[PDB]
Every structure is written in C-alpha cells, then in structure tokens.
Design a protein around this ligand. Structure first.
Ligand code: HEM
Ligand code: HEM
Lengths: 460, 460
C-alpha cells in the first residue's frame, strides 16, 4: 500500500514524493550513485525516500554520520538492512545481527590483524608473480588487455591460497572445479528484476526461505561446504584464513557451518570489489601518465629495480597510498553505507523512528564540491601528508567506519598495493584505441565501468 | 515485473505508457469514467492499458463491440475477468465460466421471463405502497429527504419479497437480522486499497482462497445459507425467485449451494444498482421540473388519478420509458463491459492475444459527442419513438448486450418504473438548499453522486 509513505512528510523531512507500492524505486533508473547525487543537490543535508514501503533516511552531516556509524553503533545502529532470501548464509558476519554479529566480529577480528596480514604476504606475493607472467605473455603478443580478466583472476588466486590453501592459477585453469564454483560469487545487482521485486514485495521473502530458495547459488555453497569439510579432514590430522578459523573454533565457538559461511562471504566481499578497484586504479594510471611515472619512480626508489615488495616496504610507499586512496575517493564501490534504527532515536536534534534505514551516500559525499575542490578530477595530492589532515573520515568512507566497517580493509589495501607494485615494476599501462575516455559508469546497481577497461600493456 | 507491458507496443496499439508493477492503475485517481473519457479523447477508437500486469484493450467501434459481445460470445469472449478471492460464490452466475456459466444461464433464464415478471408485479407493487407511506410521513414533517435511504430500503423490500418471500419493511425494521445481513451486500469498490493490491499482486488470490478468505462477507453468506435452508424446509412440505429456483432444480440440476449462490448474487446485482439509478432519476426529475410535470401528466392519463399500476399499463408509458433510458444513458452504473479473450482472435482486422481483457467503455460511449448531440444534457426526447431508431445498441449499453447481458434487465426496468409511478402519483420532488446542483460524481470506483441526493418532497 502506502501506509508508511507519509512518514517523512509527517517529520517535515524533504524528499521525492513516493508512488503507491513502488515508493521511489523508479528513481533508480540511472543507478544508485546518480540517484544520490541528484537527491543531494535537490534536497540538501538530509532527505527521505522509500524503497518500496521501506523508509530510508539519507544523511550528509559528518557529525550525524559519526553518531550513526560510531557513537550509537551498539545501542541503535547495529545492523544493516535485512537481507533475504538466504539460508545458512544468515550466519555470515556481514548478514548476522546484534549479539550474533558482535560475537562473530570478535571471533574473526584476530584473523585480520596486521601481524596475521604480514604472515600472509608471502602467499599474496606468489600470485603477484603469477599475475606478471600472465600479463607479460598477453603483452609480448601485442594486443590490448582486458583488466577485469587479469585482475579478476588475480583477485581469486589470492583469496583461495590465503583463505583455504588452494593454490591455483585461475586464469590458466578456468575449468578447475574450484575456480568454476568460486567465480560465481559475484556481487549482487540490487537493481536487477529479482531484487526490485523483492523490494516491492518483501513479504515474499519468508515464502522463499521456507522453500530454501536463496540468493547464494545452492550448487556453489554445497560444493564449498563439501570442500571445506575435506580440507578440515586433511589438516586434522597431518597460515591461511581457514587455518586461523579452524584454530579459533578450537576453543561461543565458531560453529562448523558458521565457519563455512565466513569463508564464502569473504570471497563474496573480496572478489569483485578488489578486482573492480584495481581496474579503476589502472584506468586512472593509464590516463594520467605523469602519475603512473611518478608512482613507478617511488617503487623503483623503495625497491631498487624489481626487488620483491615486503609488508614493511609497502607501508613505506606514500605516493602509492595516495593513488589508491584517490581512486577509492572517485570510486567507492559500496556507494552507500546503511544502518537500521533498531529503536526510536533522536540524533543531533532529529527524531528517527524505529525501523528506518539510515543511509550514508558515500559516492555523493566523495564527489561533493563543498568538501572537495574539483571533485571529478583525479588528484592524488589530495591525500598527501600535507593535505591529508583536511580530510573528514566521515565524508571519506570507502571502507565505511565504526565497529561494523570493512573488516578486510587492511588485507584489501595490502593485496591491491602488492599487485600494483609488481605490475608497475614490470610494465607501463597505456590507453588503447578502444579505451573508453573519459570513463563512463554503469547505470546499473553496481559501480563499474560501462564497458570493461582495456589497456595496452608494455614491458619495461 | 513488466514482461507483459510491451504487448500493445508490439501490436502497434496506442495507450498510456505503463509503469513497472503498477501498469496504469495510477490513472484511476479520478475513477473509471474519467480515465476512460480521457483515454478515448487522447487515443481515439482503440487503446490499450494495463491493470497491473493485466493487458486491457478498450474498443469503441460498434461493429467490433458487436463481434465481442454477440458474434463471438460463445467461441472466444464467454467470460468476464476472473474475480477473487471467492469461495462457494464461484458458482454465482455472474462469476461462473464457460460450460458452468452456459448451464446456469439456461437454468435461470426461465425465471426472468416476462410471464414470470408479470406474476411478480403484485409483490413489487406492495412495496411501492410502502415506499409511498414512508415518503409521505417523512414529508408531512417537512424536511428534505435522502433518496438513497428511501430508495435503498425500497430496493431491498422488493428483492426479499420477490426472491425469498421475506416480507419486511426494511426502513422501519432496520435491525431485523435479515435486513442487517442483506444490507451488507453492496457493490465492490474496485479502486479501494484491497482491490488495487490484488490487481498489483494477483498471485496472492490463491493464497487467500486456500485460507477461505473471500470478498463476500462470510458471516452474511453463512446467515443467508442457513435461511435458505430453513425456507426450503418450510415450502417442502406445506411466486418468488426462490420458488422458481426450487422448482427448477426439481428436475445437470441447480445444486443446493448453487441455488444459494444465485440468491445472494441477485441481491448483490440488484440492490445498490437499482437504488443508485432511482436516485439519479429523481435528481434529473427534480432539476428538470418540466420533465417531471410531463411524466406526471402521462401517468395521470394512463392511470386516472392514482389507479394502481399494472404490468400492461407500465408498458403503455412511453415518456416514462424515455426518462428511464435517458437517465441510464447519463449514468450507466456498470461503467464498463468486459470480456476475456479465451483464445487468440482476429476481429475486424485486429489481432487480440489470448488472455487480454477486451473492455467496452459504456460511460465514455454514452457521452461521446460523435454519437450524441450535447451529450451532457438530460434530454428524454433522445429516446422518443421518432429519434429512437437513431440509437446504436452497441453504443447505448446500460445493461450490456449479447448472451451474457443483464439477466435481470426486464425485472430492474419494471421494478424502477413501478416505483416511479407510485411515487410520482403522490408527490412532487424539488431541489433543497443542500441539493448539489449540478450533480458531482464520486471520484471512486463506483458511479454515484459525490454526496447523497437530498430532495424536498411535496405531497400532491
Ligand atoms: C577494495 C576492496 C574493498 C572495499 C572497497 C570494501 C568496502 C566495504 C564497505 C564499504 C563495507 C561496509 C562498511 C560499513 O558498513 O561501515 C564493507 C564491509 C565488509 N567487508 Fe569489505 N571491502 C573490500 C574488500 C574486502 C575484503 C578483501 C574482505 C575480506 C574479508 C572484506 C570483508 C568485509 C566484511 C566481512 C564486511 C562486513 C563487516 C561486518 O558487517 O562486520 N571486504 N566492505
Ligand atoms: C438498473 C439496474 C441494473 C443495471 C443498470 C444492471 C446492469 C448490468 C450490466 C451492465 C451487466 C453486465 C452485462 C454484460 O456484461 O454484457 C449486468 C449483469 C448482470 N446482472 Fe444486472 N443490472 C441491474 C440490475 C439487475 C437486477 C435487478 C438483477 C436481478 C437478478 C441483475 C442481475 C444480473 C446478473 C445475474 C448479471 C450477470 C449475467 C451473466 O453473467 O450471465 N441485475 N447487469
């Protein structure tokens, strides 16, 4: 109906007037980012809209954002919006709620410490070497390279080896059953017809769940469930995420099925995200030769030509950090951050009813001219140690913020940097005739290039 | 979704471009009649629209209308659009389909013959007398009279006595259990929130039916079911619709439950319809004193003052027939006629896919300036025996047409005429200060005055 559709009107909150049943979902016809940009421009600091019957409050004031993401994380804003239909993946840390979430976050946090990270570096390193060799041969036969294919394959190689201990060159072994399964763990397009229908008829989710219909492919999760079981029967008895998880449940203990839910959600959270960002980075480097050259000069200085990167030397590369951060400013692939008000609240003068989704529009904030000079331009100096103090951590939020921020942030940052270093040590990347310049974005539910980035790759 | 929403586009048929999920239902914001008028003006002869995902083809060419309502009634256009949730009322003749319908129509047709009608006339007559006495006393204490209350009560008195043999003065016995139940059998507002939701989510109807949720009030049908049973146990053993029905099943025979379904649907089809039209007629007569006076003169001529009307004398009153017909031209209370294409068809050059609802917009056609001079004016002479041959029976369709037209047409016409005669013999009807002039129509799903017609009633 429209019973909920008078909420923001009643609170004096501005926003696009909702249609019966649909709410404002027709405003998604150009994707999430364009919707949020336009609403921001038109309504200002705060606006309300409806995903079907679901009220969503967008906030843009960084003190408000602090209150939601940090200060009242545990009291009120603990969970993201409910998500289904799911089966056992209900126990995935990204989907879990309240005490169940707070428990998983505790069990898993030790796994993502820098100390653990540093021990994982040799493994990630090995597939940098693989990425290079794959790159090199796709180059010495001089045709333009599809980044998503080579970085996609890199993204997988690193997850498997660092999570399970499965050591596969996915690019050259694409019909390996493990590869064929895990490669299906792509990000959801919440603007596709199934999810729009679920948004308009959310009362159908329980019907789907009772039939065990789930948006995580059953065949894949079944396969991974069986794989995990056999590896646990290979480790017991005879350095990866699985081992650390195996060891932790070896004590309120990581259940068997819970363990596998986390393994799967890690792939899901890390696979296409990491691939996408690396593609964006290489696009920026290719279209800004001066930046690519300067980055190559830093790498060569820190690592006298082609010395292998280490954890310590990665942390030494300031310009590398700037390029990664500025690319993430332009392309915050989550686009929005979300928390549900689990009870009535009044934050910074504004009353928010229980059940409202409070949304932080990262993409819109990242490109807001009020906080960023020439926001559409790629300018790494934004993040130089001189200019860096100028950056509000509640305006710049590519990994979110607070207790429920990206738990794999450190790993993803390290992963990408190690990829970039090895790749840049060996090659230069340049536009091809069929490089899309300037880059156009998908008008779908995922922040990605409209067409895959294709670059000419030249050996140094 | 919108899979169906490209149908008319594919057939080159014009119409309002549909929204996802909703189709064109937001176009109903001013009711059915205004929607059809506007679409007619804007698209012309034919147009297509979507009630949710359901394609509806509106036709206005009288040869096309003939083909649908008459020529291909049995082959293709046998049923109206499916209607639920219903329980046992599935076997009501108005709701039944195909062979089940064709059977019920045969079993029930003998009941609505003129010969039967004439035998029912004394019974209907008695409640004309009751209507008058009720009117007279509400008048001699001189306050403006709410037509829907007095005609509403008349409408019920005639159904009960002529259908079951229940003889009640409903106006003065409003808490009689029979009255209290039957008075709930009002017409559905298909633009109310429940029906709009069912239109957008028709896949929910079977879920409702398996829980025996039904749009016919269960308490009422239960009561009427029990009543019918006790009267059948009073007739057996020891002139109305029930008796004629009782006698017919006394032989492919009218089942017990089927009998009761028909009794109920008759009330439903006859109660508010008859009341509404009588109210419209009195409104026209009150606002056109010359017409009311001329009608009173005919009645007095045919029935030398206050002689009781008979079947034969009713048929003698030409100006009475003209006034009734012209009121029905202005206010065709069904508004639309509908048939579903049960298979693919090509009528008059135009292909119509199986499953499309073909709709004839009676209200729009009744007020179409191309077929009617000054269509908004009340002009009984339209239907004078001189001008009457000028009337296309597929443009003027207040009772529909073909094998599935209004089976109670004769009865309803006789009923109203007998009411009007008795009422006009005794009173004159005039505007009150709070009479709405000109009359405004409801913007809801039912063709009715926006506010109830209230008239000053004066004894002759
Ligand atoms: C550059 C790549 C990545 C980006 C841009 C990214 C971004 C994000 C963002 C914005 C959130 C939501 C934070 C919030 O709501 O405040 C998130 C959550 C999460 N991410 Fe990442 N992520 C990336 C890679 C990874 C990787 C490699 C992992 C590996 C484990 C991972 C695991 C997770 C998990 C488990 C959550 C949910 C945390 C929770 O609910 O407790 N992500 N990510
Ligand atoms: C002035 C009052 C009335 C008007 C304007 C009216 C009008 C209509 C219309 C337009 C239809 C659809 C015809 C078609 O689809 O071609 C219809 C159907 C029907 N009407 Fe009436 N009606 C009235 C009174 C009555 C009464 C008193 C009865 C008593 C039995 C009745 C019984 C029915 C039935 C059973 C149907 C469905 C017939 C079938 O599907 O076979 N109506 N009516």
């Amino acid at each position: 109906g429209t019973h909920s559709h008078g909420l923001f009107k009643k609170l004096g909150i501005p926003g696009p007037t909702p249609l019966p049943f649909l709410g404002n979902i027709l405003s998604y016809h150009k994707g999430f980012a364009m919707f949020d940009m336009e609403m921001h421009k038109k309504y200002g600091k705060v606006w309300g809209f409806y995903d079907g019957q679901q009220p969503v409050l967008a906030i843009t004031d960084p003190d408000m954002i602090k209150t939601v993401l940090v200060k009242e994380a545990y009291s009120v804003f603990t969970n993201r919006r409910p998500f289904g239909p799911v089966g056992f993946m209900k126990s995935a840390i990204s989907i879990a709620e309240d005490e169940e979430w707070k428990r998983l976050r505790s069990l898993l946090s030790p796994t993502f410490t820098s100390g653990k990270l540093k021990e994982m570096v040799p493994i990630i390193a090995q597939y940098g070497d693989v990425l290079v060799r794959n790159l090199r041969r796709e180059a010495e036969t001089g045709k333009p390279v599809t980044l998503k294919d080579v970085f996609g394959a890199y993204s997988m190689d690193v997850i498997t080896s660092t999570s399970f201990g499965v050591n596969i060159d996915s690019l050259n072994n694409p019909q390996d059953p493990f590869v064929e399964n895990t490669k299906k763990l792509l990000r959801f397009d919440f603007l596709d017809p199934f999810f729009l229908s679920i948004t308009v008829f959310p009362f159908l989710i329980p019907i789907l769940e009772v039939l065990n219909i789930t948006v995580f492919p059953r065949e894949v999760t079944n396969f991974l469930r069986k794989s995990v079981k056999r590896m646990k029967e290979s480790r017991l008895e005879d350095v990866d995420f699985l081992q650390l998880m195996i060891d932790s449940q070896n004590s309120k203990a990581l259940s068997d099925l819970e363990l596998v839910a986390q393994s799967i959600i890690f792939i899901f959270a890390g696979y296409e995200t990491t691939s996408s960002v690396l593609s964006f980075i290489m696009y920026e480097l290719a279209t800004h030769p001066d930046v690519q050259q300067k980055l190559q000069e830093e790498i060569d200085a820190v690592l006298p030509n082609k010395a292998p990167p280490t954890y310590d030397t990665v942390l030494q590369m300031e310009y590398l950090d700037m390029v990664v951060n500025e690319t993430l400013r332009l392309f915050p692939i989550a686009m929005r951050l979300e928390r549900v008000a689990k009870k009535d609240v009044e934050i910074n003068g504004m009353f928010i009813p229980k059940g409202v989704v409070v949304m932080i529009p990262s993409y819109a904030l990242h490109r807001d001219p009020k906080y960023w000079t020439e926001p559409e331009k790629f300018l790494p100096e934004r993040f130089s140690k001189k200019n860096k103090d100028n950056i509000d951590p509640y305006i710049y939020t590519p990994f979110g913020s607070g207790p429920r921020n990206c738990i794999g942030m450190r790993f993803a940052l390290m992963n990408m940097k190690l990829a970039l270093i090895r790749v840049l040590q060996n090659f230069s990347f340049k536009p091809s005739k069929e490089t899309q310049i300037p880059l156009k974005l998908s008008l779908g539910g995922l922040l990605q290039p409209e067409k895959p980035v294709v670059l000419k790759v030249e050996s140094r």
